[PDB]
Design a protein around this ligand. Structure first.
Ligand SMILES: [Ca+2]
Ligand code: NA
Length: 422
């Protein structure tokens, strides 16, 4: 007689068949070798088993043999056409969403109907897991000398992760927060990476802060181990907060400087790329997205309607102005990649790149765009500081409209044609 094991992945704390079922939860079925439950030797052996003998350190031992691996659909993962045996069901870390997984457990097939009336060939089991909340990622300007984090300045990120309540008398296997920085960022400043749990620093021995390169991007990894990890289950609903700064080294080609972090309830031995995604991949819980919007101004200078050429040059500074076109009080020139003035080339062009305009991120739970230049006038403007011999300097700032908003998903550009006059 063929048997079946239907695995219903329940979300909740074991006190439970009324709990919600979850799709996309991944389980592997193993057969327990050399246990025949139809004999007294096999039955006595199976009441003797210690789970560590069958599965330990995140992996199946020689004592078991893999049958199949499957994801829940409609709340259930059904393993059909099974020969009678003792089975071990193992929830895996490669489900559709990251969860605090169920521990391995034994299932006999077939079983006696609990009523006594005959055999149950189709068995049902109800392992519980706990959900991970989506971490909240934000960006912060760490130095307010110039608004925002234009190319040549540092950005700071904050990743706030909630510690879930897990099953009574169980422990977290691990706890990693990983962030694959966008390519436009340099390596995080070692002295500015911080980690707190419920507002308190964590002792260094317990927290491993690592960076590693994957292609042209740096991954920052923070992993909890030691006593901190073993006691993490006592910090339910507290926040683990990771903050770091990194240099904005170039303008994103599409204007989008985008960051996400990922939480994994496991401490991989291999260097984990959280944005890897084949079926075998350890699935993290991704954070809320942060997108910072960049803009570029291109000046096209002429001198009496002609290309400037080899003996005609003008210089501009970028500023903020008020609604009436006048400079914001005490407005300093704006620095971009360490330049505070911009000289026109023989072709008349000057490019002001890597202007950070503002940031879209989650605020009190809703995606919100904030203008990085809020409160410093209303627009950008250019001041002409030098020109060619025989020409007049522009006496007023040149207003340049350059802004972003929550829908912005390409590089914001403005071309400014200026014809120096005689
Ligand atoms: Ca700044
Ligand atoms: Na001029």
């Amino acid at each position: 007689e063929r048997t079946s094991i239907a695995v219903h992945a329940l979300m909740g704390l074991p006190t439970s068949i009324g709990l919600p079922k979850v799709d996309g939860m991944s389980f592997t079925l193993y057969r327990v070798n050399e246990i025949d439950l139809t004999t007294q030797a096999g039955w006595d052996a199976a009441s003797k088993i210690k789970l560590e003998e069958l599965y330990t350190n995140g992996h199946p031992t020689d004592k078991v043999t893999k049958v199949a691996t499957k994801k829940t659909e409609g709340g259930v993962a059904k393993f059909d056409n099974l020969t009678p045996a003792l089975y071990l069901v193992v929830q895996e870390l490669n489900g559709a969403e990251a969860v605090v997984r169920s521990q391995p457990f034994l299932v006999a097939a077939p079983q006696t109907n609990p009523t006594g009336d005959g055999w149950l060939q189709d068995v049902h089991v109800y392992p519980k897991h706990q959900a991970l909340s989506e971490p909240v990622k934000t960006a912060v300007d760490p130095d307010a000398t110039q608004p925002g984090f234009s190319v040549g300045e540092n950005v700071k990120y904050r990743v706030a992760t909630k510690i879930p309540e897990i099953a009574s008398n169980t422990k977290f296997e691990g706890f990693t927060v990983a962030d694959k920085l966008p390519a436009e960022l340099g390596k995080p400043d070692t002295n500015k990476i911080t980690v707190t749990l419920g507002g308190k620093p964590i002792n260094s021995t317990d927290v491993s802060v690592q960076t590693y390169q994957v292609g042209d991007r740096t991954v920052l990894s923070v992993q909890l181990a030691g006593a901190t990890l073993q006691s993490l289950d006592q910090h339910k609903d507290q926040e683990l907060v990771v903050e770091f700064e990194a240099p904005v080294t170039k303008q994103p080609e599409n204007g989008q400087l985008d960051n996400q972090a990922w939480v994994l309830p496991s401490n991989p031995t291999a260097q984990w790329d959280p944005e890897e995604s084949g079926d075998a991949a350890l699935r993290g819980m991704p954070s809320s997205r942060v997108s910072s919007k960049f803009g570029q101004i291109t000046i096209e200078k002429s001198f009496d309607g002609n290309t400037p050429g080899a003996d005609r040059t003008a210089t501009f500074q970028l500023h903020r102005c008020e609604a009436d076109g006048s400079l914001v009080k005490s407005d300093p020139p704006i620095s971009l990649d360490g330049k505070q003035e911009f000289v026109t080339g023989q072709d008349g062009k000057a490019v002001l790149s890597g202007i950070h305009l503002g940031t879209l991120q989650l605020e009190s739970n809703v995606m919100k765009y904030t203008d990085a230049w809020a409160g410093k006038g209303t627009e950008f403007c250019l001041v002409e500081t030098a020109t060619a011999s025989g020409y007049e300097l522009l006496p007023k700032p040149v207003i340049v409209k350059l802004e972003a908003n929550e829908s912005t998903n390409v590089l914001v550009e403005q071309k400014v044609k200026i014809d120096n006059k005689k």
